[PDB]
Design a protein around this ligand. Structure first.
Ligand code: HEM
Length: 445
């Protein structure tokens, strides 16, 4: 790997308090290219730079292009990815959703790219945006944007449902020092043209990655109310038992504690411990892997998206199964905190959610595969008893309607729940984040 030439959000994440997703079209390739080379390319933050606190810019900038943006730039080379080429709108029906609920700018292929601006204040971001718009002039056009932020206080690093996020990533072999239980993968799973990437890419694409962007609204008061209404009977407060159900749905407690290691009560100390909070496989000493949902439901979100021992491999950490289906996640929450009024009425009045960002070298193996073949598949994971696992309670989709999810109730692993959508996709796009040398190189030529 040459982490000098790889955009930082791909392998490191921007790790700033604020981010802006600036979605643009290219009006005029010729003028746009000039300013791409002079104004954008030299300030794109790399993995190497973001990997050291002393070399992190006040504004971390990354930029990615859609198939039609690349077309607008006169670049027609085959990036080796049909899903990217066709755009996410065309792919929506693969996830049993429709472009009906999408931001209208996303329901098409008019968006040519996205600029990711990140800084610890919104002030610095808007300065950089004002400069970009000034210098590019009418060669660029803003079609849509989404402002996002780290949540405040003790919810920093947690997503809108309140769960600590950004714990689990694939370790890239030869680059990351793997953590206990962490999967270890070839660089080519995430970085196009890198080690063991079987797909031929254009020359200017080596060091890049596909960026799956999803604007995912979360119905937080509704979720909270559902958990309280369905809290399993037992010891502790109603909220504690409600939290237990929530944790069974995610596969982690709000603290980050993986339920597979903490199956009856939260242990917040575990969530804060990078050396132990991923050290599991779903295998347990005296339990049948195929039928035991006492530690973690077969349908739990993280078990659906990283099956670990459910797809074979070592029963002791680290489990190394399904390395090719790993994704890097750089998502960040958007929208305001939940208000008292919303909580009292258990009803959302304004949009908040996750600005979901997934990187992978193959869309068909990454985001698209986890959503369609695993999360939305009522019979995944395979070989379980009962065999009908049901859907991912967090992201599983059923054309807008309630999702049948099994195994969630600790007192009865055959008990089914009919769970309304908590996450409402408003769509997004598939982009390609090029290596930095390509931005001021071929893409500006
Ligand atoms: C609003 C929607 C979503 C929410 C609230 C959500 C929430 C979470 C949470 C709380 C975790 C645990 C933190 C961690 O392990 O790092 C997690 C992990 C993860 N999620 Fe999601 N997520 C969402 C969307 C998605 C989507 C759309 C995908 C893929 C299609 C996805 C794939 C993953 C993966 C791969 C992990 C790590 C699993 C592992 O390595 O064990 N998430 N998510």
């Amino acid at each position: 790997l040459n982490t000098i030439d790889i955009q930082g959000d791909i392998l490191v994440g921007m790790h700033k308090q604020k981010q802006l997703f600036y979605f643009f079209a290219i009006n005029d390739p010729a003028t746009f290219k000039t300013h791409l080379a002079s104004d954008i390319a030299p300030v794109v933050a790399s993995v190497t730079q973001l990997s050291n606190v002393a070399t992190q810019p006040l504004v971390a900038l990354n930029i990615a292009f859609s198939n039609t943006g690349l077309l607008a730039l006169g670049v027609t080379d085959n990036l080796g990815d049909s899903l990217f080429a066709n755009g996410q709108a065309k792919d929506a029906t693969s996830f049993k959703e429709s472009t009906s609920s999408w931001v209208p700018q996303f329901a098409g292929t008019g968006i040519h790219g996205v600029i990711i601006l990140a800084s610890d204040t919104t002030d610095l971001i808007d300065q950089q945006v004002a400069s970009i718009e000034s210098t590019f002039g009418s060669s660029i056009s803003k079609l849509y944007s989404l402002s996002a932020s780290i949540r405040p206080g003790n919810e920093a690093g947690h997503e809108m449902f309140g769960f600590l996020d950004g714990i689990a990533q694939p370790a890239i072999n030869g680059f990351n020092t793997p953590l206990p239980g962490q999967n270890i993968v070839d660089a080519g799973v995430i970085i196009t043209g890198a080690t063991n990437d079987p797909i031929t890419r254009p020359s200017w694409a080596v060091g890049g990655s596909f960026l799956a962007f999803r604007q995912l609204e979360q119905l937080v008061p509704e979720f909270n109310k559902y958990l309280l209404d369905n809290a399993p009977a037992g010891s502790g407060s109603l909220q504690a038992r409600a939290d237990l159900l929530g944790a069974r749905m995610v596969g982690r407690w709000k603290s980050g504690a993986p339920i597979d290691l903490t199956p009856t009560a939260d242990d917040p100390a575990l969530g804060a411990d990078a050396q132990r909070n991923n050290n599991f496989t779903y295998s347990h000493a005296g339990f049948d892997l195929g039928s035991d949902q006492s530690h973690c439901p077969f349908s739990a979100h993280i078990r659906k998206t990283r099956p670990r021992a459910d797809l074979g491999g070592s029963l002791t950490p680290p489990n190394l199964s399904a390395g090719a289906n790993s994704i890097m996640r750089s998502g960040i929450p958007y929208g305001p905190e939940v208000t008292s009024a919303e909580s009292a009425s258990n009803t959302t009045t304004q949009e908040r959610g996750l600005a979901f960002v997934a990187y992978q070298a193959q869309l068909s193996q990454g985001f698209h595969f986890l959503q369609q073949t695993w999360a939305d598949n009522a019979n995944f994971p395979p070989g379980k008893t009962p065999a009908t696992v049901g859907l991912d309670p967090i992201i599983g989709q059923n054309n807008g309607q309630p999702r049948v999810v099994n195994g969630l109730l600790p007192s009865n692993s055959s008990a089914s729940l009919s769970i309304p959508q908590f996450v409402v996709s408003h769509g997004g796009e598939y982009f390609f984040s090029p290596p930095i040398s390509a931005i001021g190189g071929r893409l500006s030529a």
